[PDB]
Amino acid sequence: VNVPKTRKTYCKGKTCRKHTQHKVTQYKAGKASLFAQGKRRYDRKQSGFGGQTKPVFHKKAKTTKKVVLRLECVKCKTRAQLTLKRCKHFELG
Amino acid sequence: MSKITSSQVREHVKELLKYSNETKKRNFLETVELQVGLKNYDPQRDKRFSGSLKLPNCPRPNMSICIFGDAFDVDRAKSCGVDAMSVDDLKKLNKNKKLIKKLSKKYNAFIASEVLIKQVPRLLGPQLSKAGKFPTPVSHNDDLYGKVTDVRSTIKFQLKKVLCLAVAVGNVEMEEDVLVNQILMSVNFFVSLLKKNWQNVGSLVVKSSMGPAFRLY
Amino acid sequence: GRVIRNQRKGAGSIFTSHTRLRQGAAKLRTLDYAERHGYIRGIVKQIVHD
């Protein structure tokens, strides 16, 4: 699918509150090790004797993924997110 | 790199503009180019990245772009007063194999017709792209003078087998603050183009085309 | 499974050596001053089966 990298939509910033122009990028993610409560809990549960202690998922069925767009306002610098359907090829031409 | 309080580049640009024409008032060859060497990246192991980051500020006015096209863009090129070419002319150019390797040297670039560029891939044969002169297309309703201005002001960072990419980023003519804006734009484009957004860039140098000993970057 | 036979041979219960009719351990004379500096003479009295 093709989506242009510019789009005029509504933004809910306190200064704008109207239809403004945004530019479009795609969303990605990160992670954290000596920070997050789940990781700090899992490591202590994992230490010692006993084995694995949590499930491990290996029965993947989907082959594609939904795509999320991040929109940044050119006059406000207030981002917004918008999800699309499942597609196999995506670009921002 | 992530930008580093550009007053050092400001003093370097001032020393370069006092080197050119204030200690050697040479003939008009103003081109204050920025040379950048990258560090900590393997050419074969990493992807060979490239982009073009065309700033409208111009420094190389004398350029050769033999507009290859059809009849209507030939008349448009004759109006814009630039060196054009014809269809039978390009057919003779692909006929004589030695003429292409010379016409790639008598020209400085090229600008093709969105009606004949999907043939320069095969008709005008190889070594044009090896000399990095693959023509950029121009439409049937866009301005030819504006496209020639853009093809004279369009700079392109490409990753070769060497980590020493240099670009004619400015002229030594004038406009210290506009030159500072050009240096900021080039540094931003290189830092965003590299894989690590700050760490990979090592060597930055200014040289006003005269083998000047004023880099200070 | 269970403990196999070559594993069982190391506890040494019914796998020890049968040493009743043996004449004694066969070894050389202890090194001392006479063998270290000169020589000494003995005599062989009997040649036996072990």
Binding site: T64 | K47, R48, I117, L123 | -
Partner: protein, 245 residues
Amino acid sequence: NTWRATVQIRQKVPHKRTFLFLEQLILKHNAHVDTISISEAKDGLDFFYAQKNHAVKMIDFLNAVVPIKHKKSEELISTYKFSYSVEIVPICKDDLVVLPKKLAKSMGNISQFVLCSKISNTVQFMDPTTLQTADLSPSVYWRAPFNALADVTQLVEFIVLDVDSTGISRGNRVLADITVARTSDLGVNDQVYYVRSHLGGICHAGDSVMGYFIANSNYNSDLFDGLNIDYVPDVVLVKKLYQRK
């Protein structure tokens, strides 16, 4: 309940390329001498046999042409029907594969990001970026199986702009380096790609070549996302079209 032997050949792929090669080879050797009947299916076919001798020699013939795994099953009527379930390895030639890490390390320390280059009684993978092959056997596949990344439907076209070389060849394949562009924006953009490939001796500047475009791709694969980002390329080139007329 009237045959006593059934052989069921299956391949769980929409585009059954290895299965159609197998059908051409069965038709070109005429191994279907003693078939009672043939049942079509969605992913293969069933051959029928009056005694199990022709069935086991069909298994013997199939065990040396294609990478398969077969299992035996016993039926009762109240004298015993037999059923032979044969599965072909669902990886066809010119398909793009990400390998498991331990298998890739044990199979010659090859890259995980490979291409299926030849199918025989075993299967053969090859790294297109550096010319290097590997042989995977059906039993070591079926010990812990995996799937392919992309099949031959998302092959996009590419226009070759320029060729170089590196000198290294391993016979029939000259590992070179070519600059290329897409035929959906060659007359639109200034976007060029630089691909180190094994289509160096076969390709010259100005023609069309099929490939995988990784930079426009939504891949949901744990083997893929366990890779590194910089060591996966943008384009993987597979084959040249070259239509005469």
